[PDB]
Amino acid sequence: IKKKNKDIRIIPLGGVGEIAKNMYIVEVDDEMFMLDAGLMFPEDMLGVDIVIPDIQYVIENKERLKGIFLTHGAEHAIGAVSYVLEQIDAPVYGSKLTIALVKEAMKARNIKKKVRYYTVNHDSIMRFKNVNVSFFNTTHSIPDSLGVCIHTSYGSIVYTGEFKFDQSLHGHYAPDLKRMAEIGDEGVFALISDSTEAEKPGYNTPENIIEHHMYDAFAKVKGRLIVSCYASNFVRIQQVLNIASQLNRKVSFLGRESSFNIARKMGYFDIPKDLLIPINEVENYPKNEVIIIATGMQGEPVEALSQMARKKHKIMNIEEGDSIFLAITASANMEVIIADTLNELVRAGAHIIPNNKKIHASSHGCMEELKMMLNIMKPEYFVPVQGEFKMQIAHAKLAAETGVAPEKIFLVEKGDVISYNGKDMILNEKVQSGNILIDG
Ligand SMILES: [Mn+2]
């Protein structure tokens, strides 16, 4: 008698009907797994710093939680982890970089409670009573990103995390195409995949082409340059460093960097000597010899840029003639603050470097990249996540184009329970879900 699985549940607690705050619960009989535990920055809400998922359902069932599996070190994947760990004790699995960044987050909140970290890579197989869990490298804007593969007797449940495909990224950004093909060939029962850019035809612009266009843009800047991006966009940061070196500009960080210091020590960045300067040293240089990378005190870049624009920032403000490169991907949640910030910058006499119409810059696969993942995985059932409802619908259309049966595509809201019993996949239950608002 071999152990066989009977009942599966997939429950989004965050990351659907929105693009951040990923958190997906998978249950296989009496074992429960949490896939990601992200935060989201507040929508144009009052006195809120961050929003995290309501995990009451997990707390009610906490004796069954076997682990928290983190795909990558960005706030969309790990921003709620410290808050989850206050409520429940479970092991935390993630790549070496992901684990280091979670530790830094715990340290920043002065949480001294013991945590069971377990570093994993693409050769790790974690064995539980009901299932085994394996991992594969993905391409994203932070290295050491992993997809998660839960092996069941019905086939695999694959969670992509956030990903794209771009042959100009290498090393710790290279995707495990052969391992992914093997997972697909062996049989995927359900694919849970990132819908963020599912509305956008084609492919993301390759990062080499982006870097070349950034060079051209930056070369035209006559005064100071401020780059606004996520601290977790290591690709963009590296590009800025490269370009600064070529243009004889110094680089200074404005924002909490913790992430950079940790990643540099682990060897993730290529940094010229004498390139980086402390932020208090910037006013000592000519304006045309500095780039400031402004990533946000809390990790939210547009808030920091808004402060600078309105001359409200504690450390450094915008001045007339400054140029702004906004390297962020707008969401519905953010479109008001972005619009307001752009207006504030123009009022302040700053120059916003235009979007190139020929460039589509994102960290998430556009249609053809999502189709590539669908065609490699060949899932039986499909659950588009990480998106507003319209993105999830666009992704569902891609799945149907690739051959997924339309009746096997599930469009879910937070708290919905997709369930399988070996006979039928249903959506017939809801659990508690929602937004927990966090301030200072
Ligand atoms: Mn991400």
Tell me the β-bridge partners of 8. 28, 420
d(CA 108, CA 125): 31
d(CA 279, CA 268): 22
Listed resolution, Å: 1.2
Compute the distance from residue 4 Cα to the ligand 1 centre, in Å: 34
Nearest to 385 by CA among 17, 70, 9, 80: 17
Question: What is the CATH architecture of 8-202+362-438?
Answer: 4-Layer Sandwich (3.60)
Compute the distance from residue 412 Cα to the ligand 1 centre, in Å: 21
Residue 326: which H helix or E strand, with range?
A: strand 323-327
- Whether residue 224 contacts residue 292, with contact meaning beta carbons closer than 8 Å, is answered with yes
Compute the distance from residue 335 Cα to the ligand 1 centre, in Å: 18
Specify the residue for token string 């896939």.
35
Compute the distance from residue 74 Cα to the ligand 1 centre, in Å: 5
Two domains, one topology: 8-202+362-438 and 207-352: no
Nearest to 74 by CA among 146, 12, 124: 146
The type of residue at 118 is: Y
Indicate the domain borders of the chain: 8-202+362-438, 207-352
Residue 85 has what DSSP assignment?
A: H
What would the DSSP string read from start to end of 390-428? HHHHHHHHHHHHHT--GGGB----TTEEEEE-SS-EEEE
Compute the distance from residue 248 Cα to the ligand 1 centre, in Å: 31
Compute the distance from residue 323 Cα to the ligand 1 centre, in Å: 26
Compute the distance from residue 77 Cα to the ligand 1 centre, in Å: 7
Compute the distance from residue 232 Cα to the ligand 1 centre, in Å: 8
- Whether residue 149 contacts residue 136, with contact meaning beta carbons closer than 8 Å, is answered with yes
If DSSP codes are grouped into helix, strand and coil, which group holds residue 290? strand
d(CA 14, CA 235): 26
d(CA 226, CA 311): 14
Nearest to 35 by CA among 147, 152, 154: 147
Residue 244: which H helix or E strand, with range?
A: helix 234-246
Compute the distance from residue 40 Cα to the ligand 1 centre, in Å: 11
Count of C-beta atoms within a 10 Å radius of residue 401: 12
Compute the distance from residue 76 Cα to the ligand 1 centre, in Å: 6
Compute the distance from residue 378 Cα to the ligand 1 centre, in Å: 24
Per-residue CA distances from 123 to 126, 135, 165, 432 (Å): 10, 7, 21, 36
Residue 82: which H helix or E strand, with range?
A: helix 81-87
Specify the residue for token string 């208090």.
280
Compute the distance from residue 224 Cα to the ligand 1 centre, in Å: 28
The type of residue at 427 is: L
Compute the distance from residue 147 Cα to the ligand 1 centre, in Å: 12
CATH of domain 207-352: 3.40.50.10710
> How far does Cα 251 stand from its chain's mean position?
25
- Nearest-Å Rg of the Cα atoms of the chain is 22
Compute the distance from residue 194 Cα to the ligand 1 centre, in Å: 10
Compute the distance from residue 280 Cα to the ligand 1 centre, in Å: 30
- Whether residue 227 contacts residue 418, with contact meaning beta carbons closer than 8 Å, is answered with no
Count of alpha carbons within 13 Å of 146, Cβ hemisphere only? 28
Compute the distance from residue 209 Cα to the ligand 1 centre, in Å: 21
Compute the distance from residue 72 Cα to the ligand 1 centre, in Å: 7
